[PDB]
Amino acid sequence: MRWYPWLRPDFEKLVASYQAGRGHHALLIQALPGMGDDALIYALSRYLLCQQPQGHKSCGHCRGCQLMQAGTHPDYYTLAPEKGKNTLGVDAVREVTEKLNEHARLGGAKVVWVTDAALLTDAAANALLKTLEEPPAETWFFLATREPERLLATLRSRCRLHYLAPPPEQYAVTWLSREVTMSQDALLAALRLSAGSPGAALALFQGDNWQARETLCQALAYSVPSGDWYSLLAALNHEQAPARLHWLATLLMDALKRHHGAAQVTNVDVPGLVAELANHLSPSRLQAILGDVCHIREQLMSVTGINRELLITDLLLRIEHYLQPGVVLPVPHL
Amino acid sequence: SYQVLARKWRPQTFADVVGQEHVLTALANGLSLGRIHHAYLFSGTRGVGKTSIARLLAKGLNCETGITATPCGVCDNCREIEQGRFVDLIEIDAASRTKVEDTRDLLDNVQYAPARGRFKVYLIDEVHMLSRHSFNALLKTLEEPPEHVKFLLATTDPQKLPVTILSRCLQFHLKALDVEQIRHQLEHILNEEHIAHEPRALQLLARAAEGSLRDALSLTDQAIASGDGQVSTQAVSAMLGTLDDDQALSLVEAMVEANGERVMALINEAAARGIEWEALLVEMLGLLHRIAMVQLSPAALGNDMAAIELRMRELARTIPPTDIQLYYQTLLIGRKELPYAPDRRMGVEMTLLRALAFHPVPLPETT
Amino acid sequence: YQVLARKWRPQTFADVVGQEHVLTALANGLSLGRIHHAYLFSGTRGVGKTSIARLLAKGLNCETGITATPCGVCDNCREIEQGRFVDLIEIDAASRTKVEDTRDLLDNVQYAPARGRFKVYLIDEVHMLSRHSFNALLKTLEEPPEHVKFLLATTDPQKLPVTILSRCLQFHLKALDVEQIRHQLEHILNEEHIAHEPRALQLLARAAEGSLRDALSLTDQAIASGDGQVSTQAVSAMLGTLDDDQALSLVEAMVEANGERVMALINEAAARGIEWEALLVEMLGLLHRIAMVQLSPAALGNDMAAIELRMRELARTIPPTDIQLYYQTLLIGRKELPYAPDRRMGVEMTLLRALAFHPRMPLPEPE
Amino acid sequence: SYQVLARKWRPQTFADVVGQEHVLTALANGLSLGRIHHAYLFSGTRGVGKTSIARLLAKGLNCETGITATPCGVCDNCREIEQGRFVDLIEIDAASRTKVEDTRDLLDNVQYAPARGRFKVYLIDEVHMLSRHSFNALLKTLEEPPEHVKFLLATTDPQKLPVTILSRCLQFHLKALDVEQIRHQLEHILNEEHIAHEPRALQLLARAAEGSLRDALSLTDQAIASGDGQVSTQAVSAMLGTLDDDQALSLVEAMVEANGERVMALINEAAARGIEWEALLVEMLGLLHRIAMVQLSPAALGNDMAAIELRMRELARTIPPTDIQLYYQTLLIGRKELPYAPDRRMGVEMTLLRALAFHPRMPLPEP
Amino acid sequence: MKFTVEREHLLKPLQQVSGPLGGRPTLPILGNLLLQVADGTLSLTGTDLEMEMVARVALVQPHEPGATTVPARKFFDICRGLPEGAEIAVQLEGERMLVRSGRSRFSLSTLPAADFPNLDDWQSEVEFTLPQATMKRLIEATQFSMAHQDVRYYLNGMLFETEGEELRTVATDGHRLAVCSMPIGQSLPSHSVIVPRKGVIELMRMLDGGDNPLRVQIGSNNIRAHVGDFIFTSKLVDGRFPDYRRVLPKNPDKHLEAGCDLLKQAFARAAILSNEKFRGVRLYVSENQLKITANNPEQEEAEEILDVTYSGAEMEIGFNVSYVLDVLNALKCENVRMMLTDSVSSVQIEDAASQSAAYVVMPMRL
DNA sequence: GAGATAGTTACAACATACGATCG
DNA sequence: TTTTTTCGATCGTATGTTGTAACTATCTC
Ligand SMILES: Nc1ncnc2c1ncn2[C@@H]1O[C@H](COP(=O)(O)OP(=O)(O)O)[C@@H](O)[C@H]1O
Ligand SMILES: Nc1ncnc2c1ncn2[C@@H]1O[C@H](COP(=O)(O)OP(=O)(O)O)[C@@H](O)[C@H]1O
Ligand SMILES: Nc1ncnc2c1ncn2[C@@H]1O[C@H](COP(=O)(O)OP(=O)(O)O)[C@@H](O)[C@H]1O
Ligand code: ALF
Ligand code: ALF
Ligand code: ALF
Ligand SMILES: [Mg+2]
Ligand SMILES: [Mg+2]
Ligand SMILES: [Mg+2]
Ligand SMILES: [Zn+2]
Ligand SMILES: [Zn+2]
Ligand SMILES: [Zn+2]
Ligand SMILES: [Zn+2]
């Protein structure tokens, strides 16, 4: 949780509202992963819970600040999924709702933070509606998500929505160059893969994900001339399958764009691979493979407990089957 | 203390509720004629005032003056209900009380006389969230309860409720508020609140409300917060990301002529400018619909599009109706699955590629 | 004002609508003296299960004796009518489903009835009982005391164990016909001295499916909305269903490929401010009715008599393939309506799509 | 009066019980030769004679004359056991009392010698409902039983019992009573009761019994009630039609033979009884899938679907596979498009019509 | 840091401190308790983020001032395990704390004191002191009517109202109401507050009839009670409470005066055959005549006749016997006065001797 | 010969383990 | 020489452990 500079302007607005007392009791922040919305929410909560703040900065020495640093403030309830799980249950939401009834122990404001609104189940989202609609006095909520359209309409309508705009591409590239040392094409490719969100590309570079991407690219380069896509299984069967499927979809889309003729592509560091992919496949086949890859990624991310190995094996077998002549390709439908 | 416009402007009388004329008329007639039922179920979309209607009905039932369709709003019972501390009004959040034990405890207290009011009102919010056993337990008492208890049900998913419950309730369907009604309410609220505004901003907010008044109020509050305390047309346009210019016309023309480079360059420029993709898709769908309707009859074109009329006419002369239908359907499908795509830009590009195939540091306190 | 449903519960076998077979079987059993000790009743909601169960219980315990025509005036009949008889143990299985409750109930079944000749246990919502509760009743059902009778009522008999189903005589109640519901509503309204019209009764009977309680609830709602009277316009407004004439005219215009007439009628409907989803549903229903008429002449009932002949004309001229194409086109249009930019735009585009692919008169192509 | 037909005709001698020849012969030989096990466990379906055979064995195990397979039926012990008030015969309904305390007391009671019988027999019925601690106590008591104590167990789900208890007792499994034996028993009972009957009515009752004599007797009593003191073909047929709940197979059979009026009649009959349309559609899909798999291999049809084995086998034999595949595909499409149909019933009727007299056009890869 | 104390004095304050702490701490800090040696005393404080219990024990033996945290369960086990008369020494050695429990040395983990969430600055909106007997009487006479678990969260507590010179306690659950009042001899501003049921139970258990007075302070969001050398702090419901005045019937006319013992015996005898699930009874009131009737599901009837002083018209009214018995038990008076208006109105109960306490029961309409 | 205190038994509340149904 | 499961939310039954209140028995006034 680092404070990126580009978050400074938006913060300056939000806190100002809370300085005038005309602050909404339910703020929903929309931002891509790695943008730093969590840092903004933490700063806002820290300012709210400070007993005697000056300007836009918490004092850092009052009881509230000391407890926040210790992380044992009686207020500041936090909702997050269990360590072993990946969803937020109704029990935690109901417990927080029950606890909110009583007065504030420190006599200040009560802050509730939801780690990620998209992880809430249907029951939890429905339960939180009444609490969000008419919260007690001096109660503040903070929700974070990357796609508000996924949330329930009833839940969305009860929150004031604030959107964070990613910075300019040139500024992000310069910041990444100052941070990490890599080729310009690699930086551009990482930034575009992260939907132009600096911080996510930095995280991608920090881990071994770049080596996995290179291995996947080499495997695809070997596989495309041969027509044996099954070999890609070893490069895709992993806990981070959605990211690799996203990379494959990006490669296919870049190949299709090159086939149609374009100047801007996502994969800037591998012109040879995209050119070879475009040469060896028809645009219709590329479209079909892209659609299947996206559908499989969505199914993998949505369904819980689904076995990834079987799904990926079936996907690869279907991809190999499509390339045969005289086969009905799929068509999107409602 | 300060309260948002959504909750502060909750209607307090039958004269402060916009629309829903049939429901209000039915309630008034029932109260006047004395034909009082013991099971009312308000169903409809969200942000239309089901809970407000239920609260007003409960207030009217338990008014000191008597059973009237126009609550005074000043007697002890009315103000007590407004403050939410009235004893005989039991507001049950069904979304957090789904267990059978709570319902059984509730139904064991129905035989006691009301404390101070003449009726014991149970207002169940979001009754669709209860379990099956809860519904079955309710059924018996709800069929024929005592004479001093009334049940009020509010929900937005009537399909969830079993047919058995629906067969023993008076159902009232709330319609979605029209754009004109929402605009009128918004301007009235802003005038009462002493906030500057312009007609275009109110029209845009009403159109974007999608028939929900709560959404309209939330958007108005967002604009006020980000509009430096003023509801300006420019501020609302910037917040909503309206296309304004004729970008959609250029994109649809490029798609129709099947020029991949042009459409890709336009999409790249739009992404650099940072526009909303949903608005772009809606604008393109509207343009396709207008082109088709004009192709039906030359005079169908509206007067607001004169500045771009001529170009559109050419499309209506060069594109068969079937191709227009195909493009509209493809754009609609792309809009439907836009959220599920890994990126919004990727979804838009995929939809356009599908369509192209158709052709003959100051850190405050954070680590 | 006591609601119509509670007021008009049948009090004799001559006051029950339909259900001839079960009534005849019960009358024969009571007359011949061949009386079982376990009866189960099944059927859809609001068809008279509890009513006939209570009537049978009253017939068994009547002072005059055991007859199929209870007097309805003796003390036992009066107490059972008022729901306070001591020998009619009514149990709400939905509210008490734990095994210990069943154990307590069965521990004191040996004692003789207080005043009546039989001690009748009437369990409602049997399907809510737990598995242990079901098992605990097997021996008692098989060999109960001579002065004990069990009456069971449920909506889904398939949920019970097969063992219980083999121990009791099963009676299945059928959904009431439209004519029976209309006649019952007419009789009730005449007894209540309320103005009514044949069209309103027909619409209410159609909208009540087969449950008479739903019909009574709808009648009460219509009376409330109509201000003490039942009128065809009031019923139409309550149900929010447009008259068949407009939909039939629109379908005829679509079939003959008259774009201008269709557009004018759509504009007129928009001026009327009707619901678009209801319009599409009505058009689909009309197409389905035409297809069924093509399947067999008798598929059309008298409810469409007002337009029957005209509708029949469409049956002998449109080939079945065209009917199927129109039905599928409208179904697809209704499927994609929610994502359209506007309901009016969605319906207009669906109609334009139907016209463009018209089998006989497609729109002209460009040159 | 007349008691109950099932309860009155409980067998009281080994010569009266019909069927189950192997169990009776084994028990008779064991009693004659003195080979008596320490614990018996009777298993089978409902209403086959488990309790009756257990009671007969208990009666024959303590007769005054001696241990024999043909008890006199006249001595004091036989008479008292018939009346169900014998001192030594301790019959316990395990379903009503499952807690550890009751079983503990009952098993501690074994330490006393029998009062007036050579054996003290415990007849535990519905043993599968006992608690785990109850099973532990029973196993502890049953590991080393006394010489004068015997245990008789009756159960319908033996798999619930632990393996340890199963290993300590000899298990006898009963089979279905078959049509002919049930018909003969019904004929004998009706002849004894002096009630008129017809052979076809008895055949229909036996067929509907489905290997359960208790069900056959219950249906016979219900038919007698409906027939006004007699059994007739028309009355029984009407009763079965009212109770008939196999509309899915009948609909499939009517559709496969290209009949329209029959399909409409079946749809109306299904609508008369409260039924979920989607449930009917999925049932039809399952039936078609089963027929296809039976066509692929005759062993696909298992023992579960014994009631409708003949008709399904005939349909598989006669119908070519291509028609089955087409019907499956069209009904799958109908199920997919059902939720967007104007009405559930109308959607089902449209899908049935399509499967009856239509053929979809496959995309047929053109490139 | 270093201090040696006898086991007898240390035992019991530790039990009280560990009382509020449960098996599941859910946080490392909340599991421990804060021990502070200052001047010539030791303060042990324990909190669970809802209620705080702090005990103070004066120490005469030499000691080193300090403030740290120690696990509650380990310290309780150490103090309980030792035999009678053992002297316990404790010393903080660096990161660890060494306890010389008898002849066995034990090591305990120590966490920083600055991370303990305990109140430091207290502001009192009202403050006073009164003998423990009055508080015990009020709580005992008002708690039985308090709700246990209900949707209306504001009814799950007890209402304390300082009015003029007196203190009033109100409890209700939507079916019956209990009101008590007593003077304290001190002028106070009009102020009403709600205390949660758990806090009320803890306070009631705290009292033991000692002669030492109890000091009560009420702040903006908290209530503190000091008794002897123990301080208990709790938070407030903050949900508003309905006024009891409107609940009481207005202008009651029918009055019955009876003997408390006779009514108690009659109700207890009639309750034998009363329905177990509902426990409902019927009262017929006539001129100097009270007829009590009870019924059972199996038609078992019980009847009782009582002679009282009544002059109004005939009446018939249903009731729940359990509430009446509870009110009679809590009243503890020789004569009982019941005020009623009609057959569907609430009925008030008090003692003819004095009107300090009152109760209201809502009839069970059938 | 009666009243007060201590010990034992009974009832209610809370916690743990196992089995079953629907989305 | 072995190998072998989706998850969340809700309902029901049986057994074991702990705490508080009421009743009975014994000792001292
Ligand atoms: N018909 C209406 N007229 C005026 N305001 C309305 C109306 N319907 C809803 N609102 C506004 O929406 C807010 C929330 O409405 P709500 O009670 O949640 O309705 P629902 O229960 O249908 O969501 C209210 O504060 C009110 O200001
Ligand atoms: N056969 C019938 N004849 C007359 N009225 C009926 C009949 N069946 C149902 N009703 C009406 O339906 C209402 C409710 O019936 P109910 O007793 O709930 O049946 P069920 O137990 O099947 O739900 C009653 O008010 C009654 O008038
Ligand atoms: N073999 C048989 N012969 C005659 N009657 C039988 C036979 N089996 C069952 N019955 C009938 O079934 C009833 C007894 O049920 P039973 O079969 O003992 O229950 P279960 O077998 O389910 O324990 C009696 O009324 C009896 O007439
Ligand atoms: F409170 Al709502 F739809 F009833 F948001
Ligand atoms: F009371 Al019902 F079906 F609703 F029997
Ligand atoms: F009598 Al059974 F199963 F019906 F034992
Ligand atoms: Mg609401
Ligand atoms: Mg019923
Ligand atoms: Mg049996
Ligand atoms: Zn601070
Ligand atoms: Zn009023
Ligand atoms: Zn009678
Ligand atoms: Zn004998």
Residue in chain A nearest E223 by alpha carbon: A105
Q: Specify if A58 maps to a domain.
A: yes
Q: How far apart are CA A90 and CA A97, in angstroms?
A: 11
For E84, phi then psi, to 5°, come to -75, 140
For E21, phi then psi, to 5°, come to -65, 135
Q: How far apart are CA C129 and CA C141, in angstroms?
A: 15
Do A228 and A105 fall into the same domain?
A: no
Tokens of D21: 């020849």
Footprint of strand G on the protein (CB under 7 A): A 85, 87, 89-91, 121, 123-124, 304-305, 307; B 98-100, 131, 133-134; C 97-100, 130, 132-133; D 98-100, 131-134
CATH of residue A74: 3.40.50.300
- Yes or no, beta carbons of A70 and E115 under 8 Å apart: yes
Contacts of E343 in chain B (CB under 8 A): none
The answer to whether E278 contacts chain B (CB < 8 Å) is: yes
Do A324 and A279 fall into the same domain?
A: yes
Contacts of B167 in chain C (CB under 8 A): 45-46, 211, 213-214, 217
Helix (H, G, I), strand (E, B) or coil at C207: helix
Do A190 and A157 fall into the same domain?
A: no
Residue nearest to atom 3 of ligand 4 (CA): B46
Measured CA to CA in angstroms, residue D333 lies from B362, C229, D264, D276, D336 at distances of: 62, 46, 20, 18, 5
Residues with their C more than 2.5 Å from the N of the next written residue in chain B, i.e. before a break, are 360
Q: How far apart are CA B155 and CA B42, in angstroms?
A: 6
- Yes or no, beta carbons of E238 and A136 under 8 Å apart: yes
User: At how many degrees (to 10) do helices D247-256 and D261-272 cross?
Assistant: 170
Q: Domain E248-364: state its class.
A: alpha beta
Amino acid found at D92: I
Q: How far apart are CA A165 and CA A198, in angstroms?
A: 11
Do A238 and A154 fall into the same domain?
A: no
| Span from the CA of A299 to the centroid of ligand 11 (angstroms) | 56
Q: Answer yes or no: is C6 CB < 7 A from strand F.
A: no
Helix (H, G, I), strand (E, B) or coil at C121: strand
Gap between the terminal Cα atoms of chain D: 81
User: Per-residue b/e over A89-100, b at no fewer than 16 CB within 10 Å?
Assistant: bbebbbebbeee
CA angle D84, D89, D91 (to 5 degrees): 75
> Residues with Cβ within 5 Å of ion ligand 13?
D 63, 71-72, 75, 78
Q: How far apart are CA D50 and CA D160, in angstroms?
A: 17
| Span from the CA of D96 to the centroid of ligand 6 (angstroms) | 14
Q: How far is the CA of E334 from the C1' of G12 (A)?
A: 48
Q: How far does Cα D245 stand from its chain's mean position?
A: 17
- Residues framing ligand 2 (Cβ under 6 A): C 5, 8-10, 16-19, 45-51, 153, 212-213, 216
Measured CA to CA in angstroms, residue D3 lies from C36, C144, C169, C350, D8 at distances of: 8, 12, 15, 69, 6
Residues 6 or more apart whose Cβ sits within 8 Å of residue E61:
E3, E4, E5
Q: How far apart are CA C212 and CA C200, in angstroms?
A: 16
Tokens of D22: 């192997």
The annotation status of E154 as a binding-site residue, yes or no, is yes
Parse chain E into domains and list their residue ranges.
1-123, 124-247, 248-364
The annotation status of C168 as a binding-site residue, yes or no, is no
Measured CA to CA in angstroms, residue A310 lies from A323, B332, D223, E116 at distances of: 21, 32, 57, 52
User: At how many degrees (to 10) do helices B260-273 and B344-356 cross?
Assistant: 160
3-state secondary structure B296-318: HCHHHCCHHHHHHHHHHHHHHHH
Q: How far apart are CA D141 and CA D104, in angstroms?
A: 9
Residues 6 or more apart whose Cβ sits within 8 Å of residue A5:
B361
Q: How far apart are CA E94 and CA C332, in angstroms?
A: 77
**Residue C258: other Cβ atoms inside 10 A:** 15
Report the number of distinct structural domains present in chain A.
3
Binding residues of B for ATP are 44-51
For residue D342, give the nearest of C106, C285, C320 by CB distance: C285
- Residues framing ligand 5 (Cβ under 6 A): B 143, 164; C 45-46, 49-50, 153, 155
Partner residues linked to E193 by β-bridges: E160
The answer to whether B169 contacts chain C (CB < 8 Å) is: yes
User: Per-residue b/e over E238-274, b at no fewer than 16 CB within 10 Å?
Assistant: bbebbebeebbbeebebbbebebeebbebbeebbebb
CA angle A35, B215, A14 (to 5 degrees): 40
Tokens of A56: 């836009």
Which nucleotides along chain F are within 7 A of a protein C-beta?
20, 22
Q: How far apart are CA C242 and CA C266, in angstroms?
A: 13
B-proximal residues of E, 301-320, CB under 8 Å: none
CB C124 within 8 A of CB C90: yes
Tokens of C31: 């007359």
Q: Which run of H or of E encompasses B93?
A: strand B89-93
Residues 6 or more apart whose Cβ sits within 8 Å of residue B204:
B233, B236, B237, B240, B242
User: At how many degrees (to 10) do helices C343-356 and B321-336 cross?
Assistant: 140
Please name which of D18, D27, D21 lies closest in space to residue D60, comparing C-alpha atoms. Answer: D27
Residue nearest to atom 4 of ligand 6 (CA): D46
Q: How far apart are CA B323 and CA B320, in angstroms?
A: 6
Tokens of B164: 């058995």
- The DSSP line for D64-78 is SS-S-SS--S-SHHH
For residue A157, give the nearest of B125, B212, B333 by CB distance: B212
From A159, A176, A207, give the residue that closes a domain: A207
- The DSSP line for A296-331 is HHHHHHHSSS--HHHHHHHHHHHHHHHTSSS-PPP-
Which nucleotides along chain G are within 7 A of a protein C-beta?
6-16
Regarding beta strands C148-153 and D170-173, do their DSSP bridges make them parallel or antiparallel, or are they unpaired? unpaired
Nearest residue (CA) to C1' of G6:
A305
Q: Specify if A142 maps to a domain.
A: yes
Q: Specify if A55 maps to a domain.
A: yes
Sign of the dihedral defined by the CA atoms of residues B252, B258, B260, B265, in that order: negative
Sign of the dihedral defined by the CA atoms of residues C134, C137, C143, C144, in that order: negative
Pocket test for ligand 1, best of B125, B190, B213 (most atoms within 8 A of CB): B213
Tokens of A309: 């190995």
Q: Specify if A106 maps to a domain.
A: yes
Sort C297 into a burial class: Cβ within 10 Å, 0-12 / 13-18 / 19+. exposed
Q: How far apart are CA D90 and CA D78, in angstroms?
A: 15
Do A183 and A248 fall into the same domain?
A: no
Q: Specify if A334 maps to a domain.
A: no
CATH of residue A185: 1.10.8.10
Do A263 and A140 fall into the same domain?
A: no
From A167, A188, A217, give the residue that closes a domain: A167
For residue C21, give the nearest of D129, D242, D261 by CB distance: D242
Partner residues linked to E338 by β-bridges: E256, E349
Please name which of E5, E25, E41 lies closest in space to residue E111, comparing C-alpha atoms. Answer: E25
User: Per-residue b/e over A214-247, b at no fewer than 16 CB within 10 Å?
Assistant: eebbebbeebbeeeebeebeebbeeeebbbbbbb
CATH superfamily for domain E124-247: DNA Polymerase III, subunit A, domain 2 (3.10.150.10)
Do A225 and A158 fall into the same domain?
A: no
Q: How far apart are CA B89 and CA B151, in angstroms?
A: 10
- Does this chain's domain E1-123 share its CATH topology with E248-364? yes
Resolution in A: 3.0
Name the residue range of residue A75's domain: 1-167
Please name which of A246, A224, A229 lies closest in space to residue A297, comparing C-alpha atoms. Answer: A246
Q: Answer yes or no: is C158 CB < 7 A from strand F.
A: no
Q: How far apart are CA B50 and CA A1, in angstroms?
A: 42
DSSP 8-class letter at C66: S
Helix (H, G, I), strand (E, B) or coil at A141: strand
For residue B170, give the nearest of C221, C352, C353 by CB distance: C221
| Span from the CA of C208 to the centroid of ligand 4 (angstroms) | 28
Contacts of C332 in chain A (CB under 8 A): 334
CATH of residue A241: 1.20.272.10
Ligand 4 atom closest to the CA of B125, numbered from 1: 4
Amino acid found at E143: Q
Gap between the terminal Cα atoms of chain C: 73
Q: Answer yes or no: is C131 CB < 7 A from strand F.
A: yes
What CATH number belongs to E1-123? 3.10.150.10
Q: How far apart are CA C239 and CA B22, in angstroms?
A: 11
Q: Method of determination?
A: cryo-EM
Regarding beta strands E176-183 and E126-130, do their DSSP bridges make them parallel or antiparallel, or are they unpaired? unpaired
Q: Which run of H or of E encompasses E66?
A: strand E66-71
Q: How far apart are CA D9 and CA D19, in angstroms?
A: 15
Q: Which spans in chain A are helix H?
A: 8-20, 37-49, 63-70, 90-100, 122-133, 153-157, 169-179, 184-193, 200-206, 209-226, 233-236, 241-260, 271-280, 283-302, 308-322
Residues 6 or more apart whose Cβ sits within 8 Å of residue C270:
C344
DSSP 8-class letter at A166: P
CB D316 within 8 A of CB D291: yes
Please name which of C333, C331, C328, C362 lies closest in space to residue C350, comparing C-alpha atoms. Answer: C333
Q: How far apart are CA E254 and CA D39, in angstroms?
A: 73
Q: Specify if A75 maps to a domain.
A: yes
**Residue E140: other Cβ atoms inside 10 A:** 14
